[PDB]
């Protein structure tokens, strides 16, 4: 899409990026005045208004400003102020469009003669670039394309200055011929390496002083933004001059601008009764065409669309806006809502219809105030159930909703909404049954659709031989052939894919817009690839022109960019064309017919498949050439391809407004090149160049011998009429329909629409990862960091699924801080160091040390809590518990230190103990353990509470003594093993620290000397 630029921005980059020796004068000398400014700031920051005289212009892309009286010529500064006083911010009409004027540009006026103002322009065409010069300047040139000097510089060639000094300036004064030529050459260096499309200087004010631009007109290719973001910068694309945008149009523009889908809405008149909400671009163009040709010219309220599969919230907002905009006032004949569309490819109809019923059932009252009637037509994946949903919403809410499927014509519902009808060398055989493909990209859904198409077409071998994905190694992907599973090799380089597969004669290029050019250029130097399909939407037009010229040099057939692909029923299908198998089997695309078709956009090829299925014996072949401006194959490269093939008996072409391509089809009829019956229609008349309108194309096609209907509603009728007349002389022999080999459907599709039930494993009452936020136990991660809970809080959430109080989380953190490292001598730290010195990695070292936390090392946490809990809940005093554990062996776990005894406390038992005494209500098991401590410190001086015993008993007090745990949760967490987890998670910090320490000291492999071992082996076994 090459669209216009503001002229301030045009001369901005023109002064910024020209490269020629001719002096462009008045550089960086422009001003912009708005109704949203005062004058003094740009008065003092632009001192050069204080020196020269001025010329002012409206900066809103206004066509022909001279004869309409909008330019102020040769006026001084305060004179410009009094000239701009009744003009800046007031209404004006140009052409047939009105509006306010909010932008004006001031430029230093130059005194000159009208005899040496000149005209130059460079515009883009398909076969190259046209550079046109004319010596008669000014706006009074008139007819420019018959008298001016034109030169077409080809694609992939550089301008010679000798050709422009020979051919272009032939009617120019020679005193200025050596200057401007270099300037024009420099401007071509501005035209090409800034990715322009259309650029006029009219007039080019060149004097003896130098060169000057006064007026510019440029359409630039925005899709090359990824090439020019470092060179354009903050570039704005203005709208055309028309009426002021409504705030709801601005809201739909904002919702399109934040989202990835395509949302469009433009009102024709706000008090119309025919409101349309169509899914599809060419579909909505055809619906608005059929409305404006069936008498609904005046009260067609809007045209807009929702496509690219929008979300539920996005289509709810779109349907909310379009339902509110027809609520404001009432119309005595009643209002009509047309929710139409063509056959969708992969979109579930029920999701978008769930958005629509969320808008409708919330707006049921105000919609049945204004006497509305809703007509719905749909098709695609799961359309019948969505039609049933919106019909039952119409039946409960009382609003009349007439749902329709693929058995109706597409635009019949606006014929019966308005009451006009009742309410009920290049090859010629591209694809074959032995065609093998190579797919560029990770597109397993498209490859699986191609294999499913091959299975339902009774084919022997898959269409896809390999895939090419450069971001991973050579492996195999698992795909389905009916019921059986096959493997398709995924290669990394394309040369590896071509060496293993010499029978591949088509490549499907699913690359992005910025990497399809390099992939296609690297593809075209392989001689086995005879045809390429480019899928990407938005390849800039110079790059696809280079692709066209190398394809024409090499002789390969590019199915053009921005296409869905092409489908030849019975043999081959490109990627995702057709859609799911519901659309392939519903439109009978598994057996060959005798009708070919060519479309431009892809969204209408589904409806053409449906029309040729329901009126004719079927499609033989069908190719969408693409929505780009310069497709890799036009209409003619495929109509010559169909005219030479003997299998097809009639051709159908659906064109678009714009471009004189169908007149070549007329010319091919009048010379006798095309003999087979042609049925054309150029969609989108809607006139509410003059040879590029669809009514002129339809008129010149209807006169040349092409069966052209009166509207789109009669297209299936005229195809059926030509078909029955072409059977009537006996050249089409319809074969009797064989049933296709059926497939099992899918698991994901049958569970997405919810008709299969599977029992699940892994019940996980922890950490919902699905959704928009990571939820912990029941609390989102933003609430985790907002409620200011630390690592003790998230251990409370992950381990216990409970929001612990703020002292218990800090106690958990304190326990993780004291159960960290305890030196390298101990058993697990030793194993981690022996592992780290063997050079392993962090996980194996930590893991080899962690797998010693058992009963003897690290198991006093859980045992010293089970023992004291089984003693305290049995109901014996401590002086009997010590003697009970004295008559059985088995020392009290959690009692005793080897050094820190009494009058010498352990000082990490003490920090914990004064935490549990202060911030911690009702601690009976710690009091019991301290009474056992009082009894045992009388026996020995070094029998104190361990840290491994005090954390155990204080953690049982933490569980059963605060809130949140009853007593069977609190004992289950003490039985399952949530106290081993405290030691393991604490000691993992020390073990990772030991690993990093032995990696930082760079120690070698450990060997453990033989005089510490004392081998005690048997004599001779």
Ligand X SMILES: CC(C)(COP(=O)(O)OP(=O)(O)OC[C@H]1O[C@@H](n2cnc3c(N)ncnc32)[C@H](O)[C@@H]1OP(=O)(O)O)[C@@H](O)C(=O)NCCC(=O)NCCS
How far, in Å, CA of 25 to CA of 14, rounded?
12
Q: Please, what is the minimum distance in Å from the beta carbon of residue 991 to a second copy? A: 13
Cα separation, 246 vs 385, whole angstroms: 36
CB of 792 to a second copy, least distance (A): 25
Contact predicate 285/683, CB 8 Å: yes
Q: In whole angstroms, how close is the CB of 456 to a second copy at the nearest point?
A: 14
Could you say whether residue 536 binds ligand X (CB under 6 A)? yes
- Residue 942 or 980 with smaller CB distance to a second copy: 980
Written as six digits, the tokens of 283 are 């579909």
Q: Does 602 bind ligand X (CB under 6 A)?
A: yes
- Is 347 a known ligand-binding residue? yes
In the bound state with a second copy, the residue whose beta carbon lies nearer, of 790 and 824, is 824
**Ramachandran category for residue 1008: left, alpha or beta (phi over 0 → left; psi -120 to 50 → alpha):** left
Alpha carbon distances (Å) from 767 to 422, 762, 763, 785, 795: 57, 12, 11, 15, 12
User: Is 951 one of the binding residues for ligand X (CB under 6 A)?
Assistant: no
Torsional sign, CA 610, 616, 618, 624? negative
Q: What share of the chain is helix, strand, coil (3-state, %, to 5)?
A: 40, 15, 45
Any long-range contacts for 689-693 (C-beta under 8 Å, 24+ apart)? 689/660, 691/660, 691/663, 692/657, 692/658, 692/659, 692/660, 693/657
Residues 6+ apart with CB under 8 A from 46: 31
| Residue 52 contacts which entry, ligand X, a second copy, none (Cβ below 5-8 A, type-dependent) | none
Which stretch, 382-390, 426-434, 719-727, 822-830, contacts a second copy (CB under 8 A)?
Answer: 822-830
When asked if residue 1008 is in the footprint of a second copy (CB under 8 A), the reply is: yes
Interaction of residue 515 with ligand X, rule CB under 6 A: yes
Own/partner pairs, 167-173, CB within 8 angstroms, 24+ separation:
168/131, 168/133, 169/133, 171/134, 171/135, 172/118, 172/133, 172/135, 173/116, 173/135
Query: Measured between alpha carbons, how far is 581 from 579 in angstroms, rounded to an integer?
Result: 7
| CB 1008 to a second copy: min, Å | 4
Q: Report the nearest approach of a second copy to the CB of residue 478 (Å).
A: 6
Q: What does 834 bind: ligand X, a second copy, none (CB cut-off 5 to 8 Å by kind)?
A: a second copy
Q: Which two tokens stand for residue 561?
A: 């960019």
Interaction mask 546-575, ligand X, x per CB under 6 A: ----------------xxx-----------
Of 145-153, 176-184, 546-554, 743-751, the segment contacting a second copy by CB under 8 A is 743-751
Residues of span 746-775 touching a second copy by CB under 8 A: 746-747, 750, 754-760, 763
Q: Which stretch binds ligand X (CB under 6 A): 17-25, 161-169, 535-543, 608-616?
A: 535-543
730 is in an annotated binding site: no
Contact partner, 835, from a second copy, ligand X, none, Cβ < 5-8 Å per class: a second copy
Q: Answer whether 573's CB lies under 8 Å from 453's CB.
A: yes
Q: Could you tell me how far CA 40 lies from the centroid of its own chain?
A: 46
Minimum CB separation of residue 342 from ligand X in Å reads 11
Mapping DSSP onto H, E and C, the string for 479-492 reads EEECCEEEEEEEEC
Between CA 24 and CA 179 the distance in angstroms is 11
Residue with tokens 């450069």: 470
**Binding partner of residue 537 among ligand X, a second copy, none, CB cut-off 5 to 8 Å per kind:** ligand X
> Omega before 203 cis (within 30°)?
yes
Q: Is 422 annotated as a binding residue?
A: no
Q: Quick one: what does residue 750 bind among a second copy, ligand X, none, with the CB cut-off 5 to 8 Å set by partner type?
A: a second copy
Binding-residue total with ligand X (CB under 6 A): 15
Cβ 225 to ligand X, closest distance in Å? 13
The answer to whether 308 is annotated as binding is: yes
Check binding of 601 to ligand X (CB under 6 A): yes
Selected binder of a second copy within 830, 884, 897, 908 (CB under 8 A): 830
Least separation in angstroms between CB 410 and ligand X: 17
Q: Is 704 annotated as a binding residue?
A: yes
Q: In angstroms, give the least distance from the CB of 824 to a second copy.
A: 6
**Closest approach of ligand X to the CB of residue 759, in Å:** 21
Give phi and psi for 651, each to the nearest 5: -115, 145
Is residue 441 part of the contact set for ligand X (CB under 6 A)? yes
The response to whether 831 counts as a known ligand-binding position is no
Q: Is 711 annotated as a binding residue?
A: yes
Assess 1017 for contact with a second copy (CB under 8 A): no
Edge-to-edge order in the sheet of strand 557-559: 475-481, 484-491, 464-468, 436-440, 504-509, 531-534, 557-559
Q: Which does 96 bind (CB under 5 to 8 A by kind): a second copy, ligand X, none?
A: none
Contact pattern from residue 12 through residue 41 relative to a second copy, giving x for each residue in contact according to CB under 8 A and a dash for the rest: ------------------------------
Number of residues that bind a second copy (CB under 8 A): 44
C-beta of 709 vs 828, nearer to a second copy: 828
Smallest distance, a second copy to C-beta of residue 756, A: 5
Nearer residue to a second copy within complex by CB, 238 or 482: 482
Calculate Rg over the CA atoms of the chain.
Answer: 40
Cα 448 from Cα 798, distance rounded (Å)? 41
| Sign of the CA dihedral with 951 first, then 953, 955, and 957 last | negative
The reply, when asked if residue 117 is annotated as ligand binding, is: yes
Structure tokens at 3: 């669209």
Q: How far apart are the first and last CA of the chain?
A: 88
Does residue 538 bind ligand X (CB under 6 A)?
no
Q: Report the distance separating Cα 968 and Cα 955, nearest Å.
A: 15
Instruction: State which residue, 621 or 628, has the beta carbon closest to ligand X.
Output: 628
Residue 701 in marked binding region: yes
Tokens of 743: 């497939």
CA 778/CA 774 separation, integer angstroms: 10
Report residue 836 CA to chain centroid gap: 46
Partner from a second copy, ligand X, none contacting 208, C-beta within 5 to 8 A by type: none
Strands 595-599 and 372-377 come out as unpaired
How near is the Cβ of 744 to a second copy at its closest, in Å?
4
Point out which residues pair with 404 in neighbouring strands.
377
* Rounded CA separation 636/698 (Å): 17
Write down the least CB distance from residue 851 to a second copy, Å: 6
For the CA atoms of 205, 208, 210, 211, the dihedral, rounded to the nearest 10 degrees, stands at 20
Nearer to ligand X, 203 or 381 (CB): 381
Considering only residues 841 to 900 of the shown chain, the ones binding a second copy according to CB under 8 A are 848, 851-852, 854-857
Minimum Å gap between C-beta 618 and ligand X is 23
- Give the C-alpha separation, 338 to 996, whole Å: 68
Strand partners, 219: 4, 198
Among 146, 733, 738, 1005, binds a second copy (CB under 8 A): 1005
536 touches which of a second copy, ligand X, none (CB within 5 to 8 A by kind)? Answer: ligand X
> What is the full DSSP assignment across 758-804?
--------S---SSSS-B-SSSBHHHHHHTT--HHHHHHHHHSSS--
Q: Which is nearer to ligand X, 182 or 512 (CB)?
A: 512
Does residue 707 have a known ligand-binding role?
A: yes
Stretch that binds ligand X, among 99-107, 484-492, 530-538, 982-990 (CB under 6 A): 530-538
Binding-site residues sit at 57, 65-66, 108, 110, 117, 215, 256, 259, 261, 308, 345, 347, 363, 378, 701-711
Binding-site residues for ATP sit at 57, 65-66, 108, 110, 117, 215
Q: Which residues bind a second copy (CB under 8 A)?
A: 478, 480, 483, 485, 743-747, 750, 754-760, 763, 824-828, 830-831, 834-835, 837-839, 848, 851-852, 854-857, 1005-1010, 1013
Q: Which residues bind ligand X (CB under 6 A)?
A: 441, 510-512, 514-515, 535-537, 562-564, 601-602, 627
Binding-site residues for CoA sit at 701-711
């Amino acid at each position: 899409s090459a669209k216009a630029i503001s002229e301030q921005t045009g001369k901005e980059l023109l002064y910024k990026f020209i490269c020629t020796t001719s002096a462009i004068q008045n550089r960086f000398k422009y001003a912009r005045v708005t109704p949203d400014t005062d004058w003094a700031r740009l008065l003092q920051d632009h001192p050069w208004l204080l020196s020269q005289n001025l010329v002012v212009k409206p900066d809103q892309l206004i066509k022909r400003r001279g004869k309409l009286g909008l330019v102020g010529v040769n006026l001084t500064l305060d004179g410009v102020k009094s000239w701009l006083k009744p003009r800046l911010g007031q209404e004006a009409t140009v052409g047939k469009a009105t509006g306010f004027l909010k932008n004006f540009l001031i430029e230093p006026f130059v005194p000159h003669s009208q005899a040496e103002e000149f005209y130059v322009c460079i515009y883009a065409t398909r076969e190259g670039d046209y550079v046109l010069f004319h010596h008669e300047g000014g706006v009074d040139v008139g007819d420019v394309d018959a008298k001016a000097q034109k030169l077409l510089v080809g694609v992939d060639e550089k301008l010679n200055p000798e050709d422009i000094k020979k051919h272009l300036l032939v009617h120019a004064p020679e005193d200025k011929k050596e200057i401007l030529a270099s300037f024009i050459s420099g401007l071509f260096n501005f035209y090409e390496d800034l990715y322009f499309t259309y650029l006029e200087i009219n007039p080019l004010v060149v004097t003896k002083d130098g060169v000057y631009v006064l007026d510019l007109a440029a359409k630039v290719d925005a899709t090359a933004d990824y090439i020019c973001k470092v060179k354009w910068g903050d570039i704005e694309f203005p709208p055309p001059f028309g009426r002021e945008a409504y705030p709801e149009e601005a809201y739909i523009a904002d919702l399109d601008a934040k989202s990835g889908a395509s949302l469009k809405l433009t009102l024709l008149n706000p008090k119309g009764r025919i409101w349309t909400m169509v899914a599809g671009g060419g579909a909505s163009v055809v619906y608005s065409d059929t409305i404006c040709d069936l008498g609904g010219v005046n009260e067609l309220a809007n045209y807009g669309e929702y496509s690219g599969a929008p979300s539920e919230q996005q289509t709810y907002d779109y349907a909310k806006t379009i339902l509110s905009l027809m609520t404001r006032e009432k119309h005595p004949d009643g209002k009509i809502l047309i929710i139409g569309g063509s056959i969708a490819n992969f979109t579930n109809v029920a999701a978008t219809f769930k958005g629509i019923v969320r808008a409708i059932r919330d707006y049921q009252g105000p919609l049945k105030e204004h006497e509305v009637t809703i007509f719905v037509r749909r098709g695609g994946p799961n359309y019948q159930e969505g039609l049933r949903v919106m019909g039952e919403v119409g039946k409960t809410t009382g609003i009349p909703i007439h749902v329709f499927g693929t058995e109706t014509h597409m635009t019949a519902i606006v014929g019966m909404a308005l009451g006009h009808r009742p309410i009920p060398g290049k090859s010629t055989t591209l694809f074959s049954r032995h065609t093998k493909a190579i797919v560029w990209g990770m597109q397993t859904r498209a490859v699986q659709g191609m294999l499913d198409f091959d299975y339902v077409c009774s084919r022997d071998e898959p269409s896809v031989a390999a895939m090419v994905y450069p971001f991973t190694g050579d492996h195999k992907q698992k795909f389905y052939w009916g019921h059986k599973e096959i493997l398709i090799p995924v290669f990394k380089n394309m040369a590896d894919a071509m060496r293993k597969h010499p029978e591949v004669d088509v490549l499907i290029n699913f690359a992005s817009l910025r990497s399809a050019y390099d992939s296609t250029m690297e593809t075209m130097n392989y001689a086995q690839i005879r045809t390429i399909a480019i899928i990407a939407e938005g390849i800039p037009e110079a790059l696809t022109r280079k692709l066209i010229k190398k394809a024409d040099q090499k002789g390969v057939t590019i199915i053009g960019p921005a296409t869905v692909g092409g489908i030849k029923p019975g043999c081959f299908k490109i990627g995702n064309t057709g859609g799911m198998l519901d659309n392939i089997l519903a439109s009978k695309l598994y057996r060959p017919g005798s009708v070919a078709y060519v479309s431009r956009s892809g969204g209408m090829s589904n409806e053409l498949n449906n029309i040729i299925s329901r009126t004719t014996d079927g499609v033989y072949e069908g190719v969408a050439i693409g929505g780009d401006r310069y497709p890799g194959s036009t209409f003619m490269d495929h109509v010559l391809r169909y005219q030479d093939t003997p299998g097809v008996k009639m051709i159908v072409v659906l064109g678009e407004i714009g471009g004189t391509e169908e007149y070549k089809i007329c010319r091919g009829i009048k010379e006798g090149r095309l003999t087979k019956p042609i049925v054309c229609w150029c969609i989108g008349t809607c006139a509410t160049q003059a040879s590029e309108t669809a009514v002129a194309k339809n008129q010149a096609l209807k006169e040349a011998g092409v069966f052209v209907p009166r509207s789109f509603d009669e297209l299936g009728e005229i195809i059926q009429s030509v078909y029955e007349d072409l059977v009537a002389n006996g050249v089409i022999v319809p074969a009797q329909e064989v049933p296709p080999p059926t497939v099992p459907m899918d698991y994901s599709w049958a569970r997405e629409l919810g008709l299969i039930r599977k029992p699940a494993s892994f019940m996980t009452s922890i950490c919902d990862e699905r959704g928009q936020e990571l939820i912990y136990a029941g609390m989102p991660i933003t609430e985790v960091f907002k409620e200011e809970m630390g690592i003790g809080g998230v251990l409370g959430l992950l381990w216990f699924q409970k929001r612990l109080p703020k002292y218990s989380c800090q106690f958990i953190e304190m326990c993780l801080m004291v159960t960290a490292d305890h030196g390298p001598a101990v058993s697990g730290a030793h194993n981690t160091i022996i592992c780290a010195r063997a050079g392993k990695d962090l996980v194996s070292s930590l893991t080899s040390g962690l797998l010693t936390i058992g009963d003897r090392f690290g198991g006093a946490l859980d045992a010293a809590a089970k023992m004291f809990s089984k003693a305290f809940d049995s109901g014996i005093i401590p002086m009997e518990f010590v003697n009970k554990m004295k008559k059985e062996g088995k020392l009290i776990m959690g009692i005793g230190h080897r050094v820190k005894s009494i009058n010498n406390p352990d000082m990490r038992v003490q920090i914990l103990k004064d935490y549990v005494r202060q911030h911690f209500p009702a601690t009976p098991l710690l009091d019991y353990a301290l009474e056992v401590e009082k009894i045992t410190t009388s026996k020995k001086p070094n029998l104190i509470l361990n840290v491994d015993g005090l954390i155990g008993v204080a953690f049982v007090d933490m569980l059963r003594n605060c809130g949140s745990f009853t007593r069977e949760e609190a004992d289950e967490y003490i039985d399952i093993g949530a106290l081993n987890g405290i030691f393991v998670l604490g000691r993992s910090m020390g073990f990772i620290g030991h690993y990093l320490d032995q990696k930082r000291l760079k120690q070698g492999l450990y060997r453990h000397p033989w005089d510490d071992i004392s081998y005690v082996l048997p004599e001779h076994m």
